[PDB]
Design a protein around this ligand. Structure first.
Ligand SMILES: CCCCCCCCCCCCCCCCCC(=O)OC[C@H](COP(=O)(O)OCCN)OC(=O)CCCCCCCCCCCCCCCCC
Ligand SMILES: CCCCCCCCCCCCO[C@@H]1O[C@H](CO)[C@@H](O[C@H]2O[C@H](CO)[C@@H](O)[C@H](O)[C@H]2O)[C@H](O)[C@H]1O
Lengths: 57, 459
């Protein structure tokens, strides 16, 4: 009773129903470095301007 | 200071938009008006300086230097308009523009609060001064003189820029008012020894210090009259003014770092005074007299006493008017005989009786006859130098003796004796020349009535 698969049948992507659990860390990664703190807040003008030597703006 | 900066800038349009034959009249009239308003800077208080804004301030050190600067501009214009008579019109307007821009840089130099703003204008004064000497000088050697002037200055100025920038990194500010309160002592170390030299050697070259002076007699012999007036009257005093400011942050290292420079000055003033006795060029003689007078100013600044700074301020003002007057007097002779040799034209009191009076008055101030402000400045420096070390009175006394010797030698050689037979083009003194001399001497003698206004912040 074996039927031969048609053209394109065996290149299909199928779903597999398995009791095996999904691995958590397949790459054995270490802990990622913590990100740099994200700067937040209202952007205000520079205090007394550029402050380059004698410039007052 | 805008009430002085803006009108000074307006002199440029005035000259350029003036009718072809009114450039000297218009610039002279309105530069005199600016000099008049400069007296409003005399609003000085006992405790606090006059601080206008974040950029400019005026104390009793800068105020007399500002008034001398703005007074000198109209005087420079009168002195220049005769030897520039044949100059091209547009080149006349460019000559006046160089002088106006020199005044602009000078008044902002003497009033800048911050030392970097002072440095930039302190250096900006080179460009106009160099251009005047080299473009409008008379002889071949004006090109070498411009180069020695430029590179002597910069060889000292560039280390100063590095030192000033380093000071702002460590102190956090170069504002002079701020430095008065955040000044910290300078301890011994080779890093501080070179910081001291970097801060001081640019100003030493401007004074000039003995040893580093050989550029000055070159510039004076080659500059046009207006160049020599500003160079002697004001530009030399940039070095003294900067020293009186920057020594604030160099203590106590000045206690021992000053020794090599006091010895150069004390001995240098005797050497340069004696050189004046054997000079053949009248302009070179007057040049070498400035080196001698400014040696006293260097010593006074370096010993740091209330009397020495008061004497230092009076000398810089007194010297400025006297040296400028002497250059004008010699130039008036030059405009006739077209030579700077002192022995060429003799016995001129016979032919120009009133100009011999100006020669006499200028010589009497130059040798510091009392009670001229020339002597008030000299005496205060001698009083303080005596307390520094009693032996200095010997060097100080010798210099006064020699100072009188060449001052009257120059008067006797050019004005007295028999006139030179073959020089027959000595015209009567012009009203322009007589007014030029009187506008030097009359303020100089008037200041003996109210000498406090030139004694400086420690009065
Ligand atoms: C001339 C150019 C060719 C030769 C190269 C010039 C450098 C050689 C001369 C030595 C200069 C001294 C020096 O190197 O200063 C180093 C010192 C660094 O110390 P630092 O790392 O700052 O310590 C912690 C404090 N913040 O710096 C300091 O601590 C402060 C020093 C202030 C800045 C000094 C600038 C150098 C001045 C050298 C010339 C001085 C003499 C000028 C002579 C002019 C003559 C007309
Ligand atoms: C016109 C040129 C004029 C030139 C004037 C020359 C001035 C000469 C100043 C000599 C003193 C220099 O500054 C001197 O430096 C060293 C820093 O290394 C300091 O001394 C310090 O370091 C040295 C390292 O050799 C140690 O020996 C010493 O134990 C330590 O205290 C001195 O306490 C200080 O006095």
């Amino acid at each position: 009773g074996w039927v031969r698969p048609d053209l394109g049948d065996l290149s299909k992507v199928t779903k597999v129903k398995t009791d095996r659990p999904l691995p958590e860390n397949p790459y054995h990664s270490r802990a990622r470095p913590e990100p740099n703190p994200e700067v937040e807040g209202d952007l205000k003008p520079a205090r007394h301007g550029s402050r380059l030597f004698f410039w007052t703006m | 200071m805008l009430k002085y900066i803006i009108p000074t800038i307006m002199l440029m349009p005035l000259t350029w938009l003036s009718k072809n034959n009114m450039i000297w009249v218009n610039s002279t009239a309105h530069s005199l008006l600016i000099s008049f308003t400069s007296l409003l800077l005399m609003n000085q208080f006992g405790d606090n300086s006059l601080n206008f804004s974040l950029l400019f301030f005026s104390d009793s050190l800068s105020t007399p230097l500002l008034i001398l600067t703005m007074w000198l501009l109209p005087l420079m214009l009168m002195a220049s308009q005769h030897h520039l008579s044949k100059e091209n019109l547009t080149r006349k307007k460019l000559f006046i523009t160089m002088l106006i821009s020199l005044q602009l840089f000078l008044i902002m130099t003497f009033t800048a609060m911050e030392l970097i703003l002072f440095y930039i204008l302190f250096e900006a004064t080179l460009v106009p001064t160099l251009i005047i000497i080299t473009r409008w000088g008379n002889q071949t050697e004006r090109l070498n003189a411009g180069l020695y002037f430029l590179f002597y200055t910069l060889a000292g100025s560039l280390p100063l820029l590095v030192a000033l920038i380093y000071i702002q990194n460590t102190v956090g500010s170069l504002n002079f008012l701020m430095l008065q309160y955040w000044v910290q002592p300078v301890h011994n170390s080779w890093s501080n020894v070179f910081m001291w030299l970097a801060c001081m050697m640019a100003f030493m070259v401007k004074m000039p210090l003995y040893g580093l002076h050989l550029w000055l007699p070159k510039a004076h012999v080659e500059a046009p009259i207006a160049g020599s007036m500003v160079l002697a009257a004001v530009l030399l005093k940039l070095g003294g003014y900067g020293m009186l400011r920057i020594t604030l942050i160099l203590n106590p290292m000045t206690d021992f770092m000053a020794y090599p420079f006091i010895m150069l000055s004390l001995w240098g003033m005797i050497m340069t005074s004696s050189i004046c006795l054997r000079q053949t060029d009248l302009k070179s003689l007057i040049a070498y007299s400035s080196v001698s007078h400014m040696a006293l100013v260097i010593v006074a600044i370096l010993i740091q006493t209330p009397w020495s700074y008061m004497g230092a301020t009076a000398l810089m003002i007194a010297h400025g008017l006297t040296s400028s007057m002497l250059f004008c007097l010699a130039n008036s002779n030059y405009e006739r005989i077209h030579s700077r040799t002192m022995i060429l034209a003799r016995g001129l009191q016979t032919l120009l009786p009133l100009m011999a009076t100006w020669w006499l008055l200028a010589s009497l101030t130059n040798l510091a006859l009392p009670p001229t402000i020339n002597l008030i400045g000299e005496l205060f420096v001698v009083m303080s130098t005596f307390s520094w070390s009693n032996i200095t009175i010997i060097l100080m006394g010798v210099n006064m003796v020699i100072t009188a010797l060449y001052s009257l030698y120059m008067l006797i050689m050019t004005q007295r004796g028999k006139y030179t037979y073959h020089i027959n083009n000595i015209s009567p003194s012009f009203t322009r020349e007589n007014a030029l001399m009187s506008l030097h001497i009359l303020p100089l003698l008037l200041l003996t009535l109210n000498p406090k206004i030139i004694l400086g912040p420690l009065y």
